[PDB]
Structure formats: structure tokens, C-alpha cells
Write a protein that binds this ligand. Structure first.
Ligand SMILES: OC[C@H]1O[C@H](O)[C@H](O)[C@@H](O)[C@@H]1O
Lengths: 729, 303, 304
């Protein structure tokens, strides 16, 4: 109320020093109701100043001057100067105009996208301000669409400068926090647009077990329902709510079998053709909606209609949930048209997410992005990406940049959805990224040739995919703790580099590089390997400090930008001196919570990690070479400790503390072994290999080893040898 | 024509000659003002070198040592002495690596890969230092030639190359710091020994004369036109040449036919990054491979 | 005028600003009180220190509550205010639409340093006469970004000397100075010769200036002003008349290294033409490719 100012037909609410709501009302009434985007305008009071005259008003905070000259909002009447110097003359917002500096957000979908597509703006800007227009409908108390806002213009001016994390936290306070995911969502999902039988699906699930690949989720795509069995007078088989009985003669029994294998089960739902007269639930729906059954009147999709939504959840989904379906894959691609003006995809995500909470605690959906605030309905489903290096090269940037509009749970089809071209190396690189993405869901097109099964590929590719898929389940504790941090504290699992390093120009120059939780920095390789090196590469920016390759221990002295090379089976993931990462020791075990945690410690500095769980909190501290583990509640959990290289403690129960000062701090990784391996795999001349090995062995001074490699005629081989010299310096 | 004259000046004989064409005269003023001035400077340098050449000539005749030696005469067991076909020793004090390839128009500089034997080497003209043993690509403007002297080198130069003198009335003793050395100047009617031993420079002759000696220690003229035999202490004289990384970096970026954004970024990053290994890591990311090599030469010399 | 500025206390008093809340005198050229404080209390003290005229350097858009382009208000009001301190005074500012020739000089701004930019500029300059904006001042040698090429800098200065205004300017780079001695001895001497030639041309330029002001004739004319019915007068975009006695065909392409010369296709109207510098003759009417060393520029005068 002191944070509220009316002037002419406008209303201004100073929510934080850095966040102002700006409204216009012809009627003099302004909007207090929630909207599709905004769930909460309750914020603690803040200091600001006002200069009010007859004709004009200026609102002044620590970061912004907002001016209003009266009348209708125009670029001339409503504008703001930030109190920052990030630019020479892009420090002014004008109503209705775009400025430079927006770091972007996300978009609905990657359907049919081969590589890059345009993104919407987010709330983050290098120049320190962004405007988020609220164009949505108002809600009722219980979250039904109520109609048009009486605030016919309703904007949020963000003026956080480059405090991106606080901008995002306050956005979550305005639009509501992301809910907690359930632990099962963070495991591997299996999916394929393939007409499995109950028998061939269970045989595939048992082959995953036999192949030592853990799964959390069993997706059944659209061939679960009638497709070619649909008479053409009704249109296509794309939408379906009736089991194909040939393939699934006893659905509940099939779902019981997946449940006995400790899998959660989801079905594809294409809702757009509604419930037509051939469907199994049609007689019930027709009775509830008073349809003309002798004229075979369809229950057309209509999520604006309360009776339709009830029949959809109770009489269409209800019978399938009773057969054991755990959650819904909402797969909408049929446009944004409704008589209400609300995007049907928005109505589906909002209502289905709420309905999912009835059957299961912290339940999810799987659906496309439905605009600002739709993070309240995880998980994101990016859809029909084209299978290409260009698509993979876009995806890490896409994923990290989405955190800028608070949409932090994108599930991409890992390996790409459709079209494009076969390349087992592309499939393996894509799975490496997926394992270090918010969700790891293997999925593919209707092709006989696009299965993401590891054993589709040669023995090298298969073993590497199996190792990465196991690593995903090892990461579930770290992922689930970051998930609770997203839900409780408004911090993204995947952050662009500029969230941690806002003032470092290099944090804006590595689009595909990101922080993954608080302990790991990932630089996926998204380019086909150089056949002369038998290695792929990516330019990595190393922030100030000592960094270790998470897998090898190879060290890097920051701050530096350095091209790094990896075999197709290895991924650039880095941890700082002092990093502590927990890993499940038993990733193949079907355990609700890990019976055994490996604490992986990176030497050379202090650190700590807080492991949040369903029913506990465990703190791991590393302070002057003393490692301590405590928990809120006690348990039988057995702790394993790995300090750099060496397993120090194995399966020790309860709370404890152990001194690692005089333990071996150094990893195995050495310049000589790594040099030999890189030269050995290279498809270069044996004379060159022999000369490089002899000269780098005989030349003692680091500066002369570098001078030697600088004479090499292969420019990319120079860069690979320079990486090793830089790490071995 | 200019690169060829640079080599000629550091060859056994410097004879300008050409065909019956109206278009092939080797007159310096045939060419533009830049080329003309550089040819005139090299042609004057040849006459400055006559004392050094004539002493090497008497050594050829009396001792059977060539003025021009392949690297493998001095370094028979070093494989790199067999891999620099155009590199040679010129007398006992100078090592020459002529540039014999058209300049890279993006750098406005020509280059040659130089093998530096064990020891500290100085560019004879600039003082730019090099720590041997190393093989390093070196870049020069078209007006400059890679000629190198070791720490301790003493080269005599005629001070009056334009004078029509039977023997020089005045010798400049050019001394390269950081080690002991000596040079014996053989002449028609004399022998003059120049010795540099724990920072003491001594000149003696077999016979006496009116000859006036000038001394240049690295950068600085220490003595001017002093007659007869003498000895002078250079220990607490300035040993370091002027050549510096910053000036050389600015000059290379300024002449380059590259983008001004690239110039600005390279100048700012190499000025702001303090650790030598990170300056090298920075230049290693450059998309221009030959510009990397040019910047690496400067970092190597400035290390 | 923000609270840290030296004239702020005076402006704040005149505009009744809240100084304890450090209320800015925001730019507002629609406002008579703002314009007066700007000319009297902001420019005024600098003019008393000796500033002769104003470089108005506006790049912040066309937004005003009046709907009048702020650049238009600046050029109209500053040009008028400049006449108080000096007779026939000028500004230096961007083009503000038809009629803004009343407020010379034009300032074209932040061109990219490239052969492509130089290749555009003569056409740009001559074509502007078609909306009566005859005093464009371009940054000679180009403003920013682009790439180093001493030959581009020399060709650009040749055009500049035969342009309405010869203003050397460049970016914040340590590497973009237009000083002649930045370049090698050949380039330096040629730049010095062209810069001296500009001052030799001042009588011819000042007489054409009075003709612009009294008779409405541009200094720089496209060929089709003199030769409206000749198809070739529409096919030499970079060729122009410079006053009434000279025809200029600048070279705006990098030299052919095999010839050590640049070239341009010149249309010679009916009559006998001489290269202004060399006397080399040409019998019109003909279209002919002409070659010059980097130090020489194609400028032609008729018999008489
Ligand atoms: O259900 C069949 C297909 O429908 C749509 O194209 C979905 O986006 C895709 O994920 C699915 O496999």
C-alpha cells in the first residue's frame, strides 16, 4: 500500500528495489487477481523515492528511474533509465520498444528444427533491465480462467543489473516456485515411436536389465492405442484413448509387469481430435456431455469447457490410470486457437499438472512450453528435433538459456527425434549431453532405423552408451538434491556461465558451456571429431582457480580459454579444487534411496556439499584436509570416500570424520601417458608421431616444448598438444 | 629485388647486375621511396662490413676457413643444423637467416624458420633476444633482415663507409652483452685485438696508428673517436638493448592488414594477461595461424 | 544534465529540479525552458571558454511526445542559436529529413572501414543533391571496425578532398589514426599532397558555396544534372561534377597487383577532356577504363 502509487490512469507497485509492476486502467479499477503468469504479488516492503508534480511522476530505486508523463502509455510517455553503466546508450527502456542486451529465454518447441531457432526474450539482460508483459487472463481463487484483466496493460520492469540469480529468485516469487520433481523423473527414460506388443516391450525392458542399463521410466508411444484400426470416416488414428488389443490384450497386467520392474509408466496423449464415437470411453463421455450418439457426435477437444475437462480426466484418463498409468505425456502440436483466447497447451499443462497430484505425490506431466510461468507444470518436452550435429550443437545453449525465463526442466529427445542422418558418434555425443541435462529421455521417430538402444551400435559405441546411462543413475542423488534446491530456493540445475561470472566477458562467449548444480562445469562436444586426431574438441573457458577433469583428474589452471580434445567415448566435465560430488555406489539396484554413497573429493582446497533427500539432509565438509559427514537423522547408509584417485574408506556406517592431509592428493593423469595415447590414435604419419614423442620427451624446458609444437604443420594437432602441455605445466 | 640485395650484402661478393632489358636496372631509385631508402641503407652497410669481410678473407687465404659456412660446420652433431638450408654463419660472429619468400600481405611481413643454437642470441640490428636451443619462425618487415649475434659477440664496422679511405680512419666496435668474447681484425699492414673479459673491453694493435676507435656496448655509444690502445670497464654500463615486447607488439599489429577488432582485442588481452603461459594460451586461440606464429616469436623473445 | 555535472546547480535552479533527490534535467528539446537552459547555462559557459560551434552527435532514436524527431529539434534550434556568437556559423549533425539542408553541415557518422563503404560514398554524396542535402561530411578513411589497408585510407582521402567537406575522423582504436605519418613514406607524402590540395581548392569551394546559397546549385552533381538525356550519365554511380569546371571519377577498388594500379570506368561527355593533374587528353564521347597509381586520382577538366 505504501509500495503502491497511482498517477493519472496508471498504477505502479514497487515490489523490490529492482521490480516494478506498471498498470493502465481506463475504468480506474486495477487488477488484484492472479493471472496465468503471476501467482503472488506479496513482497516485503522496500525503500524508494517519488518526485510527483502536476503533469509527471518519477519513481527512484537503487537501480532505476521510472518516468510517467501522463496520458496513454507510449514510447514517449512511459520510459526508465537504469542506474548502471553496462552500455554507453542502451540504459533506457521505452514502452513498446526493444533494447539490446536481452540474453533470451526459450520457445514452445523444437518440432521440425534442424539446428538453431529464434528464442523469446527472458528477464536477463547484459544491460541490466527487461520488461515482462503480463498479457494473460485472470484466474479465480482455485485457478480457473476468470476472463480479461481490468489492468488492460500490466507489465513487470526488472532492473536487477547483472544479479541474474536474484532476478530469477524474485521471478519465482512473482510467478510461483517450480514444484519438486519426484526422484524417478531423474533416471533414464526409454521411449520409441514403435508398435511394441506387451511381450516385445517387456522383453526390451528385460534386455536393458541384462545389458546393465538402469531405467526409471517406460514411455509407451501412440501405437498403444488404435491407429490403422480407426475407420477413416472418423479422421486419423493420431488421437486415441482405446488400447490396441492385438498388442496389449491385458493392459493392467502389462502395467503391473512394468511396475514389478520398478518402472513408472506414461502413455502418449494426442488430445486434439477429442473423443470420437469409435472410442472405448465414448459411451460414458457421450452420456456425461449429452452427445447425439446416433449421429456419432464427437466430444471435440475443448479445455475451456469445465464439463469436457471433467469427462477427460474422470472418464478418459481415469480408466487408464486405474489400469496403472502413472502420469501423462501431453503431446499437443495443433495450434494456439480457443474461443477464450487461452492457448490450449496452457490449459492442458495447468489442468493436467493439477489433476496429476490426485493419484501421486509431486507427480509430473511431459509437455511443450506454454509461456512465462508454465515452469509450474514440469516437465518440458521439446519435441521433434531434426537428427543432426546442428541440432545437438544448439541444444546445450537452448537448455542453459531457458533458465533465463525460469523453465529449468527441459526434456529433449536424446539423440534427436526425426529425419536428419545416421552417425553413431552424433548419437553418443547426444547421450553424453543428455546425461548432463535436466532430463535423460531416449526417444526417436517412427523409422525402423532410429532406435536409441545402445546395442543398435558397434561394440565401442554400445559400451560407452552403457557407461553414460549408468552414470546418469550414479548422478541421481546430486540431481535430486539440486531439484529440491530449484523448488525451495529458485536456483536452476543448469546455469549459463554468466550467472556465476556476470562481469567476465568470456562467460558470454561459450554458449554451450554451463554449470550443472554447484560442483560441476560441463563443456559438451557437439562437433564431429577431426579424423586426423580421432578426437572431438570444444573451446573451454576455465574461470580463475584450479579445475580437474571430473573423469581423468587432468588439471587446468584458470583463468584461461583453451581448446580441449576428447575421444568420442569421453566428455569434458570439470570440478574445482575442493569439489565434493556424491554418487550412488549401486546405480543398478532398485533402491528408493541409496543404501551406499561414494563421496568424490577433488583436492587442493576446502569445500562442502549438502545432500538433500526425501527424508534427510547429509552435510559433507572438507576443511584443512579433514572430511566430515553428518546427517539430520541417523541411518544404516554406508559411506565410501574417494580422495582424488584413492578409495580411503569403504562402506562405513553413520556419522564420522577422517584426516586426508597425508593422503595422496595427486591424481594418476600424467602428461606422458596422455601424449602417447593422443599420438597413438591419430591418423597421421608414423614419422610425425615418432618425432613428436622423441622431441617432447627430450626437451626439458616447458617454453621450448611449446616452441617445438608451434612448428607443427597440423594446426589442430598443435592445439591438442598445447592442451596437454598447458595441463602438464 | 630488396630481399635479394639483403642476401647479397651478407654474401661473399655484392655485385649488382642485370639483363639487356630497359626494365631490370638494380639502381635503388628505380624503386619507390621505401624500397630505395632500404636498398641505400643495405648498400652502405656492405661498406661498413668491409673490415669484417677483409679480415675473414685473410683467414680464408691463411687458415682455410670459409667466410660463409653451413650450420653443420659449427654444429655437426645437431640434426637441426642440416634442416635450415638457407641459414649460415657469416665470419665467426654473425649467423644469417635471409628471408627468401614473398611477405604474407595480412602481416605485411616475411618469415623464415630459424634454428637458434644453445646460448643467448640477439638480432644484430634490433637487439631482440632469443634463448637457444630452439627452432622458431621469425617475421620481419621487407626493410629488415634476420641477422643474429651471440652474447659476447664483437663486430667491427667502418664508421665512415662513404669516405674514399684505403683503410678505415675510424672503427666502431659493436659489442653484444652477457658473455666474454674477442675479435682479431686482420688488415693489410696491422692486427688489432678486441677482448671482452669480465666486462673489461681492451683494444691493442701490433703496430700503433692515428685510427680513432668508437665503442658501442649493446645500445649506447660509450667512447667516441679515442686514439691508440686502451681499456675501459663496462660492468656498470647499461647491458640491455631498447627492444621491448610492447613496442614490437604495437608495431606488428599496426602494420597488419587484419580487422581493427582483432588488433584491439590482441593489444588489450596481451597487455592485461600477466602470466607468460596465459599470454601464449591467448594467442593459441587466434584464427590466423601465421599471426599466432608472429605473436609467438614476440612472446618467446619477451619471456 | 545529471547531478554530477558542473552546470547542474545552475540548470537545477532554472528548471526547479529536486537537487537532494539528484533529479536529472532529462533531454527534452520540445520544452522551451530546457532548450534555454541547454543553450545559455550548458553550451553558454563552454562558448565563453572559446568553443566556436557544436558537433551534435545524436544516435538515441526518433522518440518525443510532440512526434517531432529530437534530431530535427536539435539541428533547427542549434543552427539558429549558433548564429548569435558567429556570422554564417554551422553545426555538425546527422540528416533530419527534407528541408534539414537549412542546418549545415551533414555528419554521416559511424561508417565501417572497408573498400565497400568507400565504393558507396561518392554515389551517396552526389545522390544526396536530389533532396538538396549538399554538405555531407563523411569520416574520411571510415569510422570504425573493418580492416587496415593504407591504400584504402589514401583512396578515401582522395575522395574526401573532392567531397563537400574534408574531415579526418576515426574510432576509439589505438590503430585507426588518420595522421599521414601513421603510414609508410609513399602513403604519407601522397596524403600530405592531397591535404595541401584541399586548401588550394578553398577559393573554388567557397565560390561554389556562395552559388549553393544564392542560386540553388549543388557543389557535387550527379552526371545526369548536366547530361539528362545521355544513358551513360546514369551508369557511372561514383562519377560526378565538382563545381562547374571539374569532373571526378574516384577509384574505390583495391589496385590490381599485376598492374600496380587501380582503375574506374569513366564516361567522357562530348568534347576534349584533360586529366586535371597530368594533362593526359581524352576525346569524348567515350566510356573508357582508366588506370592510376595509388598516389594519383582521375579528375578531369574540359578544353577551356
Ligand atoms: O506420438 C507420435 C509422435 O507424435 C509427435 O510427433 C510427438 O512430438 C513425438 O514425440 C511422437 O513420437
Amino acid at each position: 500500500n505504501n509500495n503502491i502509487i497511482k498517477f493519472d490512469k496508471a498504477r505502479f507497485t514497487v515490489l523490490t528495489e529492482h521490480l516494478i509492476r506498471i498498470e493502465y486502467s481506463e475504468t480506474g479499477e486495477f487488477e488484484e487477481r492472479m493471472t496465468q503468469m503471476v501467482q503472488n504479488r506479496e513482497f516485503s516492503e522496500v525503500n524508494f523515492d517519488i518526485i510527483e508534480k502536476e503533469e509527471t511522476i518519477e519513481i527512484i530505486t537503487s537501480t532505476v528511474h521510472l518516468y510517467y508523463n501522463g496520458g496513454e502509455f507510449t514510447n514517449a510517455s512511459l520510459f526508465a533509465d537504469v542506474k548502471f553503466n553496462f552500455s554507453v546508450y542502451s540504459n533506457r527502456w521505452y514502452f513498446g520498444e526493444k533494447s539490446d542486451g536481452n540474453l533470451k529465454g526459450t520457445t514452445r518447441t523444437l518440432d521440425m528444427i534442424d539446428g538453431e531457432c529464434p528464442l523469446e526474450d527472458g528477464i536477463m539482460s547484459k544491460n541490466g533491465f527487461a520488461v515482462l508483459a503480463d498479457k494473460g487472463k485472470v484466474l479465480t481463487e482455485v485457478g480457473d480462467i476468470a476472463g480479461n484483466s481490468v489492468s488492460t496493460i500490466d507489465l513487470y520492469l526488472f532492473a536487477y543489473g547483472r544479479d541474474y540469480r536474484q532476478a530469477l529468485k524474485d521471478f519465482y516469487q512473482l510467478t510461483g516456485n517450480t514444484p519438486k520433481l519426484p526422484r524417478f523423473a531423474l533416471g533414464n527414460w526409454w521411449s520409441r515411436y514403435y508398435d511394441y506388443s506387451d511381450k516385445s516391450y517387456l522383453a526390451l525392458m528385460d534386455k536393458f536389465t541384462d545389458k546393465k542399463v538402469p531405467l526409471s521410466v517406460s514411455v509407451i508411444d501412440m501405437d498403444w492405442h488404435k491407429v490403422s484400426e480407426v475407420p477413416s470416416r472418423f479422421g486419423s488414428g493420431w488421437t486415441g484413448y482405446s488400447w490396441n488389443k492385438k498388442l496389449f490384450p491385458n493392459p493392467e497386467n502389462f502395467i503391473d509387469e512394468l511396475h514389478q520392474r520398478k518402472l513408472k509408466v506414461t502413455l502418449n496423449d494426442h488430445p486434439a481430435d477429442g473423443i470420437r464415437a469409435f472410442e472405448d470411453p465414448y459411451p460414458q463421455v457421450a452420456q456425461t456431455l449429452d452427445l447425439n450418439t446416433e449421429l456419432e457426435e464427437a466430444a471435440k477437444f475443448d479445455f475451456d469447457n469445465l464439463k469436457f475437462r471433467k469427462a477427460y480426466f474422470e472418464e478418459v484418463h481415469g480408466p487408464l490410470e486405474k489400469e496403472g498409468v502413472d502420469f501423462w505425456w501431453i503431446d499437443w502440436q495443433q495450434g494456439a486457437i480457443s474461443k477464450s483466447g487461452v492457448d490450449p497447451l496452457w490449459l492442458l499443462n495447468h489442468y493436467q499438472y493439477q489433476n496429476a497430484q490426485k493419484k501421486h505425490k509431486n507427480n509430473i506431466i511431459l509437455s511443450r512450453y506454454a509461456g512465462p510461468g508454465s515452469h509450474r507444470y514440469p516437465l518440458g518436452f521439446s519435441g521433434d528435433s531434426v537428427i543432426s550435429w546442428a541440432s545437438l550443437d544448439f541444444q546445450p545453449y537452448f537448455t542453459s538459456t531457458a533458465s533465463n525465463i525460469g523453465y529449468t526442466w527441459w526434456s529433449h529427445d536424446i539423440g534427436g527425434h526425426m529425419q536428419g542422418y545416421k552417425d553413431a558418434e552424433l548419437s553418443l555425443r547426444w547421450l553424453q549431453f543428455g546425461v548432463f541435462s535436466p532430463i535423460n529421455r531416449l526417444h526417436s521417430s517412427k523409422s525402423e532405423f532410429t532406435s536409441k538402444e545402445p546395442w543398435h551400435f558397434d561394440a565401442v559405441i554400445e559400451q560407452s552408451m552403457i557407461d553414460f546411462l549408468q552414470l546418469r543413475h550414479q548422478l541421481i542423488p546430486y540431481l535430486y538434491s539440486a531439484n529440491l534446491i530449484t523448488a525451495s530456493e529458485g536456483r536452476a540445475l543448469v546455469e549459463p556461465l554468466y550467472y556465476e561470472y556476470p562481469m567476465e566477458e568470456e562467460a558470454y562467449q561459450h554458449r554451450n558451456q554451463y554449470l550443472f548444480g554447484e560442483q560441476l562445469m560441463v563443456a559438451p562436444i557437439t562437433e564431429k571429431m577431426n579424423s586426423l586426431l580421432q578426437m572431438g574438441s570444444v573451446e573451454v573457458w576455465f574461470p580463475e582457480g584450479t579445475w580437474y577433469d571430473f573423469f581423468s583428474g587432468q588439471p587446468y589452471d584458470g583463468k584461461v580459454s583453451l581448446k580441449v580434445y576428447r575421444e568420442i567415448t569421453e566428455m569434458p566435465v570439470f570440478a574445482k579444487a575442493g569439489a565434493i560430488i556424491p554418487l550412488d555406489k549401486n546405480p543398478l539396484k532398485k533402491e528408493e534411496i541409496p543404501s551406499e554413497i561414494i563421496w568424490k573429493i577433488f583436492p587442493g582446497a576446502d569445500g562442502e556439499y549438502l545432500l538433500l533427500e526425501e527424508d534427510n539432509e547429509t552435510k559433507a565438509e572438507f576443511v584443512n584436509g579433514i572430511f566430515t559427514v553428518t546427517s539430520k537423522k541417523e541411518s544404516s547408509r554406508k559411506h565410501t570416500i574417494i580422495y582424488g584417485e584413492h578409495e580411503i574408506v569403504s562402506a562405513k556406517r553413520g556419522e564420522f570424520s577422517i584426516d586426508l592431509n597425508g593422503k595422496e592428493e595427486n591424481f594418476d593423469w600424467n602428461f606422458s601417458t596422455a601424449l602417447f595415447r593422443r599420438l597413438d590414435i591419430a591418423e597421421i604419419s608414423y614419422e610425425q608421431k615418432d618425432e613428436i614423442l622423441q622431441q617432447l620427451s627430450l626437451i626439458e624446458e616447458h617454453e621450448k616444448q611449446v616452441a617445438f609444437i608451434k612448428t607443427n604443420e597440423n594446426q589442430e594437432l598443435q592445439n591438442s598438444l598445447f592442451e596437454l602441455l598447458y595441463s602438464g605445466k
